[PDB]
Amino acid sequence: SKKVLLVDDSAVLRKIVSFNLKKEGYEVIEAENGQIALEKLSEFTPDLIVLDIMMPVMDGFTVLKKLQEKEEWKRIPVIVLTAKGGEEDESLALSLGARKVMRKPFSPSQFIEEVKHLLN
């Protein structure tokens, strides 16, 4: 089974996304902010990170920056999943090492297809 680290400050969002990921046979590890994410990332290297932008303590842009500065982290694929739209958010996220940027409210089928693109 592939392992996905799901990083979002919304418990409701994490519930929905984890449910959809598990249906595909993936195993999910959760983090409610960027700091928690990096703490868990010190322990293991997931096959994929799904990453929110707007979070307390440490936001998604900061996470992306920190992933790039470590040899162990810089190759992990990241799909940014965020309520925020606009070219600037997309450009910044990609410039900091995100693979894909997707918008909330999330379309489960489109999301899962992209996850599949990167994993299988």
Ligand SMILES: [Mg+2]
């Ligand atoms: Mg958020």
